[PDB]
Structure 1
């Protein structure tokens, strides 16, 4: 039933009235958090993690877009503290979608101002690097620049 609210959230933001987009985004992200964790059939869980992860549309590009604002704080905060329950509904099968989340959280930290949302970016990075241990999967992340 999803991707309706995804494209609704994607398209409702471009115009004015930047409190209406906030309340609609709160309602629809609550809808996604209700209607994606409830499902349990594993191929359909793969369908959901292939539905919310697209290179053109989705949550990563939607949180990439409206960061040059101040009104999209509650929805972005709900997204960034929802992804640390989505990294624990699933596991190391997300590993070919990892470096984009790392760059997302890194720019969201070094770009924003308020620590109502700056800390959960470090929460996602401190969950992710705790998970994906010292292996081949530590050579993508340039630790020599992160340090």
Structure 2
């Protein structure tokens, strides 16, 4: 869907480490922030799977103090924080996996920054 196609576009645009990549990535992140914030239950599951895939992708791929990845990562963090504001216990499968993902986010370059 729209979430998936934006996931693919942002999965592409980070191919290069450059300011334009970070700009496009954070712009698309804001777009998805205002998009998937709408209360959904069918697009919610699609958002769940795309979020899992692309969160792994950015954690293992952005993963750099370069601002074209750092600003996008922190925007992702803000969006997921305001998203757990409204998702309930649906993280029950995502709970431990994203716990490990996030603590590894910290222990990696995010510790250096």
TM-score by length of 2: 0.56
Q: Which runs of 5+ in 1 are unaligned?
A: 116-147
SS of 2:34's equivalent in the other structure is coil
Q: CA deviation at 1:99?
A: 1.4
Q: Could you say if the C-alpha distance between residues 102 and 15 of structure 1 is closer, same or farther in structure 2, counting changes exceeding 3 Å?
A: closer
Task: Note if contact 2:33-2:79 (Cα within 8 Å) is conserved in structure 1.
Answer: no
Q: Which runs of 5+ in 2 are unaligned?
A: none
Structure 1 runs of 4+ aligned residues shifted over 3 Å read: 4-71
Q: Could you say if the C-alpha distance between residues 88 and 108 of structure 1 is closer, same or farther in structure 2, counting changes exceeding 3 Å?
A: same
SS of 1:56's equivalent in the other structure is helix
Task: Note if contact 2:26-2:75 (Cα within 8 Å) is conserved in structure 1.
Answer: yes
2:103 to 103, 106, 109: 106
User: Aligned residue for 1:70?
Assistant: 67
Distance 1:52 1:98 in 2: 14
Q: Which structure has more helix as a fraction of its residues? A: 2
Q: Could you say if the C-alpha distance between residues 94 and 29 of structure 1 is closer, same or farther in structure 2, counting changes exceeding 3 Å?
A: farther
SS of 1:57's equivalent in the other structure is helix
Distance 1:40 1:18 in 2: 27
Distance 1:19 1:58 in 2: 18
Task: Note if contact 1:29-1:78 (Cα within 8 Å) is conserved in structure 2.
Answer: yes
SS of 1:81's equivalent in the other structure is helix
CA-atom RMSD, angstroms? 4.6
Kindly indicate whether structure 1 or structure 2 has the higher relative contact order, using CA contacts under 8 Å at least 6 residues apart. 2
**Residues paired across the two proteins, number:** 112
